[PDB]
């Protein structure tokens, strides 16, 4: 680590909409207003609404039948 | 400071004989039987651009000259001097009125013109093939009774005059080819 050459690196608290605050060192300077983090991102409960297969025959015999 | 022999120079080389620069356009070497071989060279007097023909005896010729031609971007003519700047040497290379022979009319600005300078002084200017100029004085294109081709003379921003079809009025930039001196487009 040289002395003058790097930007300021200070501790910043980041607040999410999951309601949790992420205290972390960073270079943004100010605080942080975060919207979506890891523990709230729909990556565990989204792998079905994200894949959206469906079935044509089911939709059909729903719309009408014999 | 290099001296060239007649049976040495093929086309392209620049010579300095008689204190006038020349440039070999073509040269056929003849070696007859039972005679002293020689060469019929077609020279280009690099000062007036007029061809002269010489037959040079195998024995001797002359030294080369400082005839170099490269693109120099026209800058401005102030008074009688046409300045340039090498793109890469950025030199205030200057010519003069004789050096610019009736190419002035084809010269506007920011024009990269290949020039030939002899011993650090440009003796000639070659205007680029096409040049965008703007008409400044032209009567309207009133068709009237024409049943044929016709045309229209048009004074340009450099003094140059050229025939333009009918529709170009004033404020139109017309592409004209410096070689012939004739209209090519309306530059849209």
């Amino acid at each position: 680590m040289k002395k003058d050459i790097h930007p300021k690196y200070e501790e910043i608290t980041a607040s999410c909409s999951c309601g949790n605050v992420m205290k972390i060192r960073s270079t943004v300077g100010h605080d942080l207003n975060l919207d979506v983090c890891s523990k709230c991102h729909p990556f565990f409960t989204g792998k079905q609404r994200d894949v959206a297969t469906g079935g044509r025959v089911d939709r059909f015999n729903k719309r009408f039948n014999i | 400071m290099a001296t060239y022999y007649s049976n040495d120079f093929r086309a392209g080389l620049k010579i300095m004989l008689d204190g006038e620069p020349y440039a070999v356009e073509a040269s056929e070497f003849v070696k007859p039987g039972k005679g002293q071989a020689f060469a019929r060279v077609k020279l280009r007097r690099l000062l007036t651009g007029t061809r002269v023909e010489k037959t040079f005896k195998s024995t001797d010729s002359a030294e080369g000259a400082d005839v170099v031609d490269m693109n120099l971007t026209y800058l401005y003519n102030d008074g009688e001097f046409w300045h340039f700047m090498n793109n890469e040497t950025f030199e205030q290379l200057s010519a003069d009125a004789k050096a610019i022979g009736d190419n002035a009319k084809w010269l506007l600005d920011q024009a990269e013109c290949i020039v030939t300078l002899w011993n650090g002084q440009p003796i000639s200017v070659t205007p680029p093939n096409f040049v965008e100029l703007e008409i400044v004085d032209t009567d309207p294109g009133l068709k009237g009774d024409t049943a044929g081709t016709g045309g229209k003379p048009a004074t340009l921003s450099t003094g140059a005059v050229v025939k333009v079809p009918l529709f170009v009025q004033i404020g139109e930039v017309i592409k004209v080819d410096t070689r012939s001196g004739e209209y090519v487009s309306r530059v849209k």
Binding site: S17, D35, R49, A52 | -
Partner: protein, 116 residues
């Protein structure tokens, strides 16, 4: 000023701003602002962060860019793989809803290609 993964401009009103999403037109944005209780004459600047999170919940109730382009392309490809008439039309880049092609297909055929 950040919703469903895309950045939304700040100087414009909320409805137009929300339309800046892929999957939200003007009526959809009107519905969003209604359900969230946020007015329409308000610009994105000067909103509570909380208000913005409410908007996020509503648009999540809808469907937007990622899943939308996924299902669009999936349907298109289902067509192009069946090889039904609409499929072949998609494949060849011609109008599908039955327009004329003797002229005026410039949108599906791009610019015109002269003979060579």
């Amino acid at each position: 000023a950040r919703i469903a993964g895309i950045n939304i401009p700040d100087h414009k009103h909320a409805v137009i701003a929300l339309t800046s999403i892929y999957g939200v037109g003007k009526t959809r944005s009107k519905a969003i602002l209604a359900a969230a209780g946020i007015a329409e004459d308000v610009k994105i600047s000067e909103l509570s962060e909380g208000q913005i999170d409410t908007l996020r919940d509503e648009v999540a109730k809808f469907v937007v860019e990622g899943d939308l382009r996924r299902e669009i392309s999936m349907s298109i490809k289902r067509l192009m793989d069946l090889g039904c008439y609409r499929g072949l039309r998609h494949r060849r880049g011609l109008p599908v809803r039955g327009q004329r092609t003797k002229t005026n297909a410039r949108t599906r055929k791009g610019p015109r290609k002269p003979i060579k």
